[PDB]
């Protein structure tokens, strides 16, 4: 699974953790909502609430996020939006 | 252009305004982040900030929404997530 970061406003480290955590979600689950749940809850646990997650092969977004708490990236062909609301 | 509501926590009036507004978005724009931006900003403007909108043909989501400010719906073949964070 090729990891490609499209837009991030978060630390080099937290980004890597987003990828690691999605990688886990993609081995466990096939359904986007379930994959999405996995990442949100994991990121709520490790970096405090509140996170929102979007997983899909085809979406665009427009959200207002907290500074340093935003990432949009692809893992394989599945795109991932994870952010904290601003 | 077929409206199908999948999950909603908002009033049926504001729901209907979400559908009307998305329709206006899809008439004016073809690109998901643009469509999403039009909807989010119209809802910030009409119902006060902060809103977030996701638009696409394939995605799933797991978000923490504010009570009465959440809809997930299809419009024709596009799915639209529109919410305020909890």
What does this protein structure show overall?
It is classed as motor protein. The entry lists the keywords Dynein, LC8, light chain, PIN, dlc1, dynll1, Microtubule, Motor protein. It forms a dimeric assembly. Biochemical and structural characterization of the PAK1- LC8 interaction. Chains A, B are Dynein light chain 1, cytoplasmic. The structure is a homodimer of 86-residue chains. By secondary structure, the first copy, chain A, is an alpha+beta fold. Chain A has one domain: 2-Layer Sandwich (Protein Inhibitor Of Neuronal Nitric Oxide Synthase), CATH 3.30.740.10. Helix content of chain A is 38%, strand content 44%. The first copy, chain A, is built from 2 helices and 4 strands; from the N terminus they run βααβββ. Chain A has helices at residues 12-28, 32-47, and strands at residues 3-9, 51-62, 65-75, 78-85. Chain A has a 4-stranded antiparallel β-sheet with strand order 1-3-4-2. Chain A is globular and about 30 Å long. The termini of chain A are far apart. Chain A binds chain B through residues 31-37, 39-41, 49-64, 79, 81, 85-86, and chain B through 31-37, 39-41, 49-64, 79, 81, 85-86. Strand 2 of chain A pairs antiparallel with strand 2 (52-62) of chain B, so a sheet runs across the interface.
């Amino acid at each position: 699974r090729k990891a490609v970061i499209k837009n991030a406003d978060m630390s080099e480290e937290m980004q890597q953790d987003a990828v690691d955590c999605a990688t886990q979600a993609l081995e466990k689950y096939n359904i986007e909502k379930d994959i999405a749940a996995y990442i949100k809850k994991e990121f709520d646990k490790k970096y405090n609430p509140t996170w929102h997650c979007i997983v899909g092969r085809n979406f665009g977004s427009y959200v207002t996020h907290e500074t340093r708490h935003f990432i949009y990236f692809y893992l394989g062909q599945v795109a991932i939006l994870l952010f904290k609301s601003g």
